A paper describes a structure:
Transcarbamylases are the enzymes that carry out this work, by carbamylating an amine using as donor the carbamyl group of CP. Similarly, agmatine, the decarboxylated analogue of arginine, can be used as a fermentative source of ATP utilizing putrescine transcarbamylase (PTC) in this process. The subunit body presents the classical transcarbamylase fold, consisting of two domains of similar size and gross fold, the N-domain (PTC residues 1–130 and 301–315), and the C-domain (residues 131–296), corresponding respectively to the polar and equatorial domains of ATC and to the CP and ornithine domains of OTC. Each subunit has a characteristic shape consisting of a hemispheric subunit body and a projecting tail formed by a C-terminal helix (helix 13) that is a characteristic and exclusive PTC feature.
We report here the crystal structure at 2.5 Å resolution of PTC from E. faecalis bound to a bisubstrate analogue inhibitor, N-(phosphonoacetyl)-putrescine (PAPU). Phasing of the diffraction data for the PTC-PAPU crystal, using molecular replacement with a polyalanine model of one subunit of Pyrococcus furiosus OTC (pfOTC; 43% identity and 74% identity+similarity for the 315-residue sequence overlapping in pfOTC and PTC), yielded two PTC protomers in the asymmetric unit. The application of the crystal symmetry to the two protomers found in the asymmetric unit of the crystal of PTC-PAPU generates two trimers. The finding in each subunit of the crystals of PTC-PAPU and PTC-PALO of very elongated masses of non-protein electron density that fit extended PAPU and PALO molecules, have clarified how can PTC discriminate between ornithine and putrescine. In the narrow and mainly hydrophobic sheath that encircles the putrescine moiety of PAPU, the phenolic ring of Y233 sits flat as a tile at the site that would be occupied by the α-COO− of ornithine, hampering ornithine but not putrescine binding. This phenolic ring is stabilized in such position by hydrophobic contacts with nearby residues and with the hydrocarbon chain of putrescine, as well as by hydrogen binding of its O atom with the side-chain N atom of Q79* from the 80-loop* of an adjacent subunit. Q79* is crucial for formation by the 80* and 230 loops of a roof over the active center that buries the bound PAPU, and that must be opened and closed in each catalytic cycle to allow substrate access and product release. The roof opening an closing cycle and the catalytic cycle may be synchronized by the hydrogen binding of this N atom of Q79* with an O atom of the phosphonate moiety of PAPU and thus of CP. Although the side chain O atom of Q79* is hydrogen-bonded to one N atom of the imidazole ring of H83* belonging to the 80-loop*, the other N atom of this imidazole is bound to the side-chain carboxylate of E236, of the 230-loop of the subunit hosting the active center. In contrast, both subunits found in the asymmetric unit of the PTC-PAPU complex have well conformed roof and loops over the bound PAPU.
Numbering used by the authors:
A (entry chain A), B (entry chain A), C (entry chain A): 1 to 340
Write the structure that this text describes.
Amino acid sequence: MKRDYVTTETYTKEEMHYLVDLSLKIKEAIKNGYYPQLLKNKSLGMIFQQSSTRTRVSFETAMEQLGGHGEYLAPGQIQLGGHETIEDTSRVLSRLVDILMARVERHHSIVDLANCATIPVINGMSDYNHPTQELGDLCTMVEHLPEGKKLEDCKVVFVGDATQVCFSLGLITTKMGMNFVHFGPEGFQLNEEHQAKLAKNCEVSGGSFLVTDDASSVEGADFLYTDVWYGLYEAELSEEERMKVFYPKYQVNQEMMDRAGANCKFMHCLPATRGEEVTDEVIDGKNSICFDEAENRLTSIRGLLVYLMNDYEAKNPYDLIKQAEAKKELEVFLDTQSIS
Amino acid sequence: MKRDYVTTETYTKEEMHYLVDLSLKIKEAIKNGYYPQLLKNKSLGMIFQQSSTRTRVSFETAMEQLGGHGEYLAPGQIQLGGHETIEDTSRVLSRLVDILMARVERHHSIVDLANCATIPVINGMSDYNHPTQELGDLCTMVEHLPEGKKLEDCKVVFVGDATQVCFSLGLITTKMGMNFVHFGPEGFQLNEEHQAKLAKNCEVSGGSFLVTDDASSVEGADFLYTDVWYGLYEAELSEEERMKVFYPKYQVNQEMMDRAGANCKFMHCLPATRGEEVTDEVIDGKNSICFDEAENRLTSIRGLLVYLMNDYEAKNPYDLIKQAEAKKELEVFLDTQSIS
Amino acid sequence: MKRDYVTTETYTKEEMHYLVDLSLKIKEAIKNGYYPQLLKNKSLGMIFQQSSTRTRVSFETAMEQLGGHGEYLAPGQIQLGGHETIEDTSRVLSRLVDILMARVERHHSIVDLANCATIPVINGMSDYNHPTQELGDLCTMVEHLPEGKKLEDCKVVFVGDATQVCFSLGLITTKMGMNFVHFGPEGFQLNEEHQAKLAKNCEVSGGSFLVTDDASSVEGADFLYTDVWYGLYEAELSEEERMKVFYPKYQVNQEMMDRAGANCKFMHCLPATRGEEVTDEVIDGKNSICFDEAENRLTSIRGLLVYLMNDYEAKNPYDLIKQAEAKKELEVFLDTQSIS
Ligand SMILES: NCCCCNC(=O)CP(=O)(O)O
Ligand SMILES: NCCCCNC(=O)CP(=O)(O)O
Ligand SMILES: NCCCCNC(=O)CP(=O)(O)O
Ligand code: NI
């Protein structure tokens, strides 16, 4: 058996809390120069159907820091495509690596990869959701609490397009019992199906959620979060199209931050298109925490990797007697046996 | 000096036997959670001119499991092409990595890479042959013997196109003293030059070989093996073209397996095109061993890497006095010496 | 704080001397089978905007040999481009890897990467200069001194186009107090701005420099060095164009070597276009040292990596008490704490 990390919809608040603390304790070790060798000789397959800097480099660096290795399996480098299905790729990689991740164009790809694999599979972003971004963002908000506020007393407002990150921020904030708002224009708001999933989180958590085009909704935000306006990477809105939909109302400028409140922190998943969703003043300013946020992509990925591999090993333990037998037989062979 | 693994034509039965046992003993160690650090700090260059999932990931995972690292040198990433020849690439990489592999469009490329390199070179597939697939397939057949049969008493029938895998399966089966058949249609059968090389293997080994379009030839097979119908990756047959040549006679369906025999196991090098060469029923069925086969691509590559590097080191031993001298001088330099 | 390696213009002769000795002592260790684990669990980001065999493989192999790992971040794989600026890429990678290198189309890219990063950045070649090639070439000339000559008594003549390598060879040779010549045709010579920088090196070093189209200038060379004629990779001269400019006067043939002197050694940064800049006879001949030169790309990159990371760690030391605290808290968490 195994466990996947495809959506936080399969994780409780208490589980996400553990993942936060695990990630933070690994971070503090590494920040101070102790690299815990928790994944010695382990291999991670990384399937990327789209561009990535933070997610990809976090996975690859994480593996090295923990004593393992990440393999960048790009499109067209591997047989997946015309020559081979997702199902076969999954079943085969299950024999050849210890853990798998993928950034996919369509969510069904990551779901099928997970369902067909006997090893843990992690969603590195889909058109639906972005669960590693959730955990990284949670870690970041935990590290940047307003003085005299608990996490669940905080208000998080996402500004602009209903992207997979928008929705993921909603999923995680409501899961943790926080107050969430999507401030977005008509036609680009979280839809009713998405809102129903947020409602369902709030029934359990005590959190709240609002989807609105009212500019006053940013007032009181502890975290103000934004993303690009060009939509899905395979069918991007042009500069003219997206400016017409979103600008100037949804640009996160200094005026909007101050309307949120003097203490409100700015978050962006990155990459940012400067001068559209956010201005240079905000993103490089005194209240921007998006670079710490970027760091925490690695923070959270180290935690996910360690938890999933530990869970896997506890469910599939090595037989220690057979291990000793196998070590010894190999040693005898190497010492006494020759091709000639 | 060094040794290469370009074709099993340069290896005896007794040598292939050693490579099998080496590979199997490393597998048993790793299966039970002991990772033998046999290639510490060693670097493998991986040149891929074509797509690959099993071969590439096996090489990269193998290096990590054994304490080393594999570098994916893709086409156009490196200077090989307009800017630089195979010969120069080989001579230069010989200075920069410890062992080299390549999947090539044309066999002469891998031969020239081998002849110009002072380090071991492994053929990761060519339009002529596929020697790592041979060793993996041998390991698989050894692990899946029919009850009450020795390896050399087994009958292996390849169905369909005379691909490099078809021929490689012939080379290895005849080398080991087994009985080989290519069941293929006129115009797509192993040619006379290829058959002569099989005949020459059989003179030494006591094995046999047949090339035929007779459907009854599958009867008695212990292993029934197939491959895709679209030919060479740079000039693929279309769906319509290849179906016209091969379908339905050469599709491995449940009817063909049962005609072979109730105990016959199904093998495919993968990737498979489901619904052409083989049906979903066979490939996912009770007698399919192609996923174990896929696993054994890694099994065999770990063995090849270890043998070739051990052979290299025995032929080019480190001077231990110089090693100690060099370690100490470096330590003095690092402790006492400064850029300022 | 940190230090970069973008140009040798920021390094003294005495500093380059240290880098040579460091590199040579690491080489001698590794040549004799001791791999110094000086970069344990460290991650290197490698941004390549252009093709590379020696530079890329040297970086990736170097990291493995020293106990770390190099990540090949290719164009379009990462978000740099339409989606993200160099500045943001730099600031983000500073959080996700420990050291960064890049081969860039335009020099400003590498300068901006360096200025925006809090981690060390290395220039892996630009349209302006090639500083890792300088150090590798210096190491090579030091290892191949003519009997009875000091380094600073040697004459180095570069033949042909005023490439970034031509200029870099000038920078390093003059920095070290050597005698430099560019033998090149009118219109393709080092320009006045470039010559001024060489003059400035010579004022301090006691070296000399000449830029000329006089064929007799090769006479007395201890090292005769050449490069391709097709210019910048994004806008290459055709075969016909470059032959018209350079051939036959600037082809390094056996006649030119013998005119330089019987002892003169031939150098090329590679890759070479055989039959243009240099003939098969010279490059494969008794006086060619370009393959040792190629080896020393790795030699020098190992030294640069170690020096820059050591400098970084001395400027940003780990707190040992916090390190011990963090190790222990993580151990308690892993032993006592559970997601359930
Ligand atoms: N709507 C676009 C969401 C992008 C999220 N960004 C990331 O995950 C960071 P990177 O891995 O793409 O660098
Ligand atoms: N005639 C096509 C033969 C393909 C052989 N297949 C393999 O080696 C597996 P992969 O490395 O291509 O995934
Ligand atoms: N004028 C072209 C200079 C090329 C320099 N060559 C190199 O750095 C070797 P590689 O890293 O391109 O293989
Ligand atoms: Ni790697």
